[PDB]
Structures are given as structure tokens and as C-alpha cells.
Amino acid sequence: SISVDALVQEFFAQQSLKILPQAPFGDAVNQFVSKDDKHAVEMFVMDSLSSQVRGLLQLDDDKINEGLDSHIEDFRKVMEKNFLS
Amino acid sequence: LNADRERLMGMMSTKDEEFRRLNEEYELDLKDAKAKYKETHIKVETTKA
Amino acid sequence: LNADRERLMGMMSTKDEEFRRLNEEYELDLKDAKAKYKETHIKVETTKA
């Protein structure tokens, strides 16, 4: 009595991905089965990496040399708060 | 003392030629080099994540 | 001709100054320049073949 798409959507909540945003990821994988886009999620992943590299290049040298482990999930929350639009 | 003075005359005279030629290869290598390491590295951690 | 001799000797001294650094570089340069291509290239053809 539970949809497999609903099952994956709810199970994407327990863990938070290192750079990928969890909610648009579920959206894309659900779209794979919904509109039968056999080749969907690779556009999502390439767009995500292209946006992430562009965003990180906008920061200063001191910030990137000091660290990079935090900025990635900072831009990840940026991505989810963009996804609501 | 005069001899010592023209010692430094010649020292700077040739060190200036060395300095300008080394500046020429520096300009070439700086045009070739830039700071491309960070561009290489950033995609690396992006891909691994 | 005095200033001429000290110009010659200053040229000698600065020349000795210049040659040593290039020799020091060329040691390491010659150590690693010749071998690597020899193995790299042939394995490239071998593997792609």
C-alpha cells in the first residue's frame, strides 16, 4: 500500500549526500520512472558538478586554501533552497 | 680603490644582462604557467564527492 | 686600457657567476630528461595495439 517512489522518497531522508542535494536527487530519480526518461539523471549530475565548480571558483584563494570540506555542503543547502523555487 | 669601483661596474654591467634575459624566460614561463593547479584540484574533489 | 682590463676581469667573474647555476640546474635536468619518454612511448603503442 506504499509506492516504491514514495519508499525511495522517504528513505532518502535518513542520510545527507556529500555534495549532491537529497531532495532534487529524489526528484530526478522519480522522474526517471515517471516520464520514462531512460537517460535522465546524468544531466542532473553534470549540471550539479558544473554549478558547484563555478560556485567554488567565485570564492577567494584564502578560503579555498584554508578549507573546502565545508563550502561543498554550504552550496548544497544553497542548492536545496534554490530547488524550492 | 678605483679597481674595486670598476669591479662593481662590471658586476652590475653583466648582472643586468643576466637579469633581463632571465626576465624574458620568466615572462614566457609566466604566460605558460598561471595558477592552474587549483583548477585541476577542484574538479578532483568535486568528482570524488 | 686599465678600465679595459678590469672590464675583461669583471666579465670573467660574472661569467663564472652565471655558469655555475646553469650547471647546477643541468645536473638534475639531465638526470631525468632522457629515460622517461623511451618507456612511455613504446608502451603507448604496445597497449593501443
**Best mutation target, B14, B16, B20, to test chain C (most C CBs within 10 A):** B14
Provide the chain A residues 9-68 that lie in CB contact (below 8 A) with chain B: 18-19, 49, 52-53, 56-57, 61, 64, 68
Find out whether C11 and B9 touch, Cβ atoms under 8 Å.
no
Handedness of CA A63, A69, A70, A76 (dihedral sign): positive
Interatomic CA distance for residues A61 and A56, integer angstroms: 10
Structure obtained using: cryo-EM
Query: Which secondary structure element, helix H or strand E, spans residue A83, and what is its range?
Result: helix A71-83
Q: Which of A19, A49, A64 sits opposite B38 (nearest CB)?
A: A64
What is the widest separation between alpha-carbon atoms in chain C? 70
3-state SS class at A9: helix
- Using CB atoms within 10 Å of the CB of residue A29, give its burial: 0 to 12 exposed, 13 to 18 middle, 19+ buried: middle
Query: Which secondary structure element, helix H or strand E, spans residue C43, and what is its range?
Result: helix C35-48
Find out whether B10 and C9 touch, Cβ atoms under 8 Å.
yes
Interatomic CA distance for residues C2 and A43, integer angstroms: 79
Residue type, A38: K
Half-sphere exposure of A82 (CA within 13 A, CB side): 10
Q: Which three cell numbers stand for residue C7?
A: 672590464
- The total of other beta-carbon atoms located within 10 Å of residue A53's CB is 15
Contact B46 A18 (CB under 8 A): no
Q: Return the closest-CA partner of residue C15 out of B22, B15, B7, B21.
A: B15
* Runs of H (alpha helix) within A2-66: 4-11, 22-34, 41-57, 61-66
Interatomic CA distance for residues B12 and C6, integer angstroms: 13
Chains that touch B (3 or more CB pairs under 8 A): A, C
- Using CB atoms within 10 Å of the CB of residue B13, give its burial: 0 to 12 exposed, 13 to 18 middle, 19+ buried: middle
Q: How far apart are the first and last CA of chain C?
A: 70
Find out whether C23 and B22 touch, Cβ atoms under 8 Å.
no
